[PDB]
């Protein structure tokens, strides 16, 4: 064809080695390229590219500010002309404008948080929408405006809740041994799956949960990790604060049973809560407690701990092998995102020109996507609001700081099993026999 002069239209300028680079192997994959040439292929006239659009929109603020993005796509939209110009308005002016509008579609639809944060950004968007013309254009863009006005505001019945020493309603009696182990693992899996689902890629992209404004940008992620940390700490605290060896063997056993049910529900965050508790300094050393622990449950806990070993080779294998719903362990995702960003260049230099490294951003987007796949399917399980609120309001650390508390735990480990073994009196008046992890009927 034939395009404007690259002096009233920056995108008109053509591909070159100083402009775009691709991969190997359909529609060709961008290795890297100037931001101009990225907005170009993002609204290319020869083909639509919904995949590249989703990916670009997920991962762009690490090289383009949202305001710059709007300015660039508007500059792309307003095209100069070079009567045989029918080919142009037919094979350029019209599909290019399609793609530009259809990128505003996606940006406004899935990524509306850019406009809630910057109000004048939304104002520029609404202006640009309201300057589109052509009787067909108006009817197409009408729906794009609908979206903006919108955002500006089973098989069988799930199994019966299980009860133990504590009866429904008696919240005062709730505790690790008086609730039913199955229902404990159930309701914790409900909390942990919700906490998981709620994590939004805007919090993971940019390694943004590791930086000084992490409390602002990644509140869902931090709330989930603090749940997991809290649960491991409550487990440790239940163990070492049970000074009687008989009662403490009951406690460690019930916790391994909870671990089994976590394994069944494919709640891997839940599995690693208990695994990390068992690995902690205060608990690891209680040889007298693990002595009286039956070998069935020792193989349970061994198989669970196996998963973490060799950089989780086995957890990754099992997470592959099984079928949703599940709760993955999030820290591996966090490390892979961080190391992909910090471990690959922001830019590639060709011919003394700087080219945004895009396949790094694509590698990020793949991991966020793999996260969001496990967020779709939910759990066939009845919510028990009271057990749930019990585990929400757990605070094993009290008013103590981290070190003060981990020290208290270790010092209790030495109190209860020194480096003779003393004898401590019983603390639980109710019986200590697990009803087991096989359900009722």
């Amino acid at each position: 064809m034939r395009l404007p002069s690259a002096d009233v239209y920056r995108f008109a300028e053509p591909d070159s080695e100083e402009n775009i680079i691709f991969e190997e192997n359909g529609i060709p994959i961008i290795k890297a390229g100037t931001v101009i040439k990225l907005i170009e292929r993002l609204t290319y006239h020869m083909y639509a590219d919904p995949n590249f659009v989703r990916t670009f929109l997920t991962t762009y603020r690490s090289f383009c500010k949202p305001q710059e993005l709007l300015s660039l796509i508007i500059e792309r939209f307003e095209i100069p002309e070079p009567a045989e110009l029918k080919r142009f308005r037919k094979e350029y002016i019209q599909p290019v404008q399609l793609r530009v509008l259809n990128v505003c579609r996606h940006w406004v639809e899935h990524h509306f948080y850019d406009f809630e944060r910057d109000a004048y950004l939304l104002q520029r968007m609404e202006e640009f929408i309201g300057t589109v013309r052509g009787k067909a254009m108006k009817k197409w863009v009408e729906s794009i405006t609908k979206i903006i006005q919108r955002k500006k505001i089973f098989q069988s019945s799930p199994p019966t809740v299980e009860w133990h020493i504590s009866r429904p309603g008696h919240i005062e009696t709730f505790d690790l041994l008086t609730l039913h182990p199955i229902e404990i693992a159930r309701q914790l899996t409900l909390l942990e799956s919700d906490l998981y689902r709620a994590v939004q890629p805007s919090e993971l992209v940019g390694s943004v949960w590791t930086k000084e404004d992490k409390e602002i940008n990644s509140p869902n992620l931090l709330k989930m990790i603090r749940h997991t940390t809290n649960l491991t700490l409550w487990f440790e605290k239940c163990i070492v604060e049970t000074e009687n060896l008989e009662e403490r063997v009951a406690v460690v056993s019930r916790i391994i049973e909870i671990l089994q049910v976590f394994q069944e529900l494919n709640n891997f965050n839940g599995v690693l809560e208990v695994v990390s508790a068992m690995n902690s300094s205060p608990v690891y050393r209680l040889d007298h407690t693990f002595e009286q622990i039956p070998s069935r449950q020792k193989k349970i806990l061994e198989e669970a701990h196996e998963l973490s070993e060799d950089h989780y080779k086995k957890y990754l294998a099992k997470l592959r092998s099984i079928n949703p719903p599940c709760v993955p362990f999030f820290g591996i995702y966090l490390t892979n995102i961080l190391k992909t960003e910090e471990g690959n260049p922001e830019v590639l230099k060709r011919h003394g020109k700087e080219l945004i490294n895009f396949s790094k951003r694509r590698k990020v987007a793949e991991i966020t996507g793999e996260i969001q796949q496990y967020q779709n399917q939910p759990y066939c399980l009845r919510v028990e609001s009271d057990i749930k609120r019990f585990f929400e309001n757990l605070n094993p650390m009290g008013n103590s700081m981290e070190k003060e508390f981990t020290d208290y735990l270790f010092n209790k480990s030495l109190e209860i099993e020194p480096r003779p073994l003393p004898r401590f009196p019983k603390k639980y008046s109710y019986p200590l026999k697990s009803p087991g992890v096989r359900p009722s009927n």
Partner: peptide
């Protein structure tokens, strides 16, 4: 020997 929960010895 291994972990407090590893296979017997």
């Amino acid at each position: 020997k291994x972990h407090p929960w590893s296979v017997a010895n």
